[PDB]
Paper text:
LDLRAD3 is a recently defined attachment and entry receptor for Venezuelan equine encephalitis virus (VEEV), a New World alphavirus that causes severe neurological disease in humans. The E2 and E1 proteins facilitate binding to entry factors and subsequent membrane fusion.
Twenty of these trimeric spikes sit on the icosahedral three-fold (i3) symmetry axes, and the other 60 spikes sit on the quasi-three-fold (q3) axes. Mature E2–E1 heterodimers assemble into trimeric spikes at the plasma membrane before budding and release of the virion from the host cell. Local resolution estimation performed in RELION revealed heterogenous resolution; the capsid proteins and membrane proximal regions of the E2–E1 heterodimers were best resolved (about 4 Å) and the membrane distal regions and LDLRAD3(D1) were less-well resolved (about 5–6 Å).
Author numbering:
A (entry chain F): 372 to 423
B (entry chain J), C (entry chain L), D (entry chain I), E (entry chain K): 114 to 275
Write the structure that this text describes.
């Protein structure tokens, strides 16, 4: 149970870090008036990024 | 010039953010998608635009939403050419120097958030979000975008939400 | 200018696509070989040109065929120099900006597919295939070719076959 | 005189109580602290003043709150010298006799609660909270304060909340 | 004529349905009792009339309430004589033919619900609740009452709530 709790805490911390990284990545992925941001996704490749 | 700037801002669909009959800010459509300062509460003065669901961006205290293409027909034109000099906006001129925008004191106050900054060609170069008292002038906290598409927010130390 | 553009389009052998007595589109000869929009049905208004067998290209919804050299004598002149500005075509002017061609609303409709876009020198820079309502203007779906010979088709989202 | 009274009431920071776009009453700042009739619902027409937390006083159906000293700079001036005669307020004159304030019929109605009563020097002598039909005139229910600082509320029998 | 119709509608106590400062419809008093379209939300622009409790009638999407006799003094006069021809209402004339009311296109829109239809004598013959685009004209969905007292609602197929 101790090992399971430690693993759960690790998973939660990893999820929180991933969410914060996604927020930080979406920070340049805001409107940034062009209505077109292929290149930020192509460079950072944080997640669900450039099709090409 | 200021007359032409106001005429261009009015002809282009721009709508203040009304709350209980009070103008608490402004929002505009640039590049075919609506943007709104997150710190300003209320709804856009356009029922059709109000129907659009916005997404939040805490880092810059700004929101964005998709605008229908038919309404994307006539929006603000953005440019990345931002040389030093003077630009025009709703409350007159703005001085650009050292990468920062500054206006004379007494220009700008709470409720002016959302007013864009236009060049001599009427193209948007920055969006005014706030400001801070700077003696004989005041320095505005603005966001500008380079030719590489990087969003950069310039915020003076202890800047007030104007 | 529009008068000269129409005179050049008429003097150069161009023929609408007739079907049951109705003009459903247009086809022209550029670079000495005939092209035809695949979505438009019917036969070219030229018995000699109709004798030419066409090949299909589903990806761009366009067809092409070989034209006899003696008839290659006088065809459209293509150029790759496509700077921003305004160009001319059958139904007036066209604005080129951000790599896209746009014309004022009410210009262009079903049956205009195939009309080329001419520069100040009368050289073809693009071919109009369709369009989509864009408020005060409309954006045309066109194909253009760079100096490297790459075929690029610009198609607005949910563009209608015009 | 009424013109000067309205000018003094407007120059001094006074704000109606807005609820759903309807004026349901009025509130003012006298002696450097805000007062509001408890029976009137809504918020003061001033975001800065609305930030102040009020305390309740059921006995008089009135509320009060502390105003910042910088905003205490310019408030109503109260006086205890209340001789018999006539005074002025927003809707004209008021007759003071036998310790009671009376105005001609047809003057005052639901939504006028909070209007102060001014003397010839522009000093507040009473606050109007309600009234009751009195034939050719109407008698207002008001609160007044003596030189000893005693709060006295004069309420006609079966007075209506106006 | 339209001037006299507007004067009669204004002199008779009629009040729009205000919600957040926006006119979303209209309500009137006919035969000494108030009626209101159920689909329109908000409160009547009359505090005294707003005090009246309404009853719902889902079948016709209409509400009704009792009006005090003293206020029943001056209400709309209804008549059952509805011959074919033309009548008058707030936005001009209305054509009555085949038992249906029709008006020219561009007349009437969302927010006009509740406007009565008057005859040459100023008597109410129908109440406008909605409409539907009918090409060069538009057909209004109305309710009318025969000399036997039967409530009949005429609703075009796929009629829109106007």
């Amino acid at each position: 149970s101790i090992c399971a709790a430690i693993a759960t805490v690790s998973v939660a911390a990893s999820t929180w870090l991933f969410c914060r990284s996604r927020v930080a990545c979406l920070t340049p992925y805001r409107l940034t008036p062009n209505a077109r941001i292929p290149f930020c996704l192509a460079v950072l490749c944080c997640a669900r990024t450039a099709r090409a | 010039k200021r007359q032409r700037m106001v005429m261009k801002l009015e002809s282009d669909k721009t709508f203040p953010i009304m709350l209980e009959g009070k103008i608490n800010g402004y929002a505009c459509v640039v590049g075919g998608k609506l943007f709104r300062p997150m710190h300003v509460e209320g709804k856009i003065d356009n029922d059709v635009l109000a129907a659009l669901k916005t997404k939040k961006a805490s880092k810059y205290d700004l929101e964005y939403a998709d605008v229908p293409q038919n309404m994307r027909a006539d929006t603000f034109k953005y440019t990345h050419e931002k040389p030093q000099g003077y630009y025009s906006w709703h409350h007159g001129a703005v001085q650009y120097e050292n990468g920062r925008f500054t206006v004379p004191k007494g220009v700008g106050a709470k409720g002016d958030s959302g007013r864009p900054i236009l060049d001599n060609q009427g193209r948007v170069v920055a969006i005014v979000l706030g400001g801070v008292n700077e003696g004989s002038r005041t320095a505005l906290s603005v966001v500008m975008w380079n030719e590489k598409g990087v969003t950069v927010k310039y915020t003076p130390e202890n800047c007030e939400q104007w």
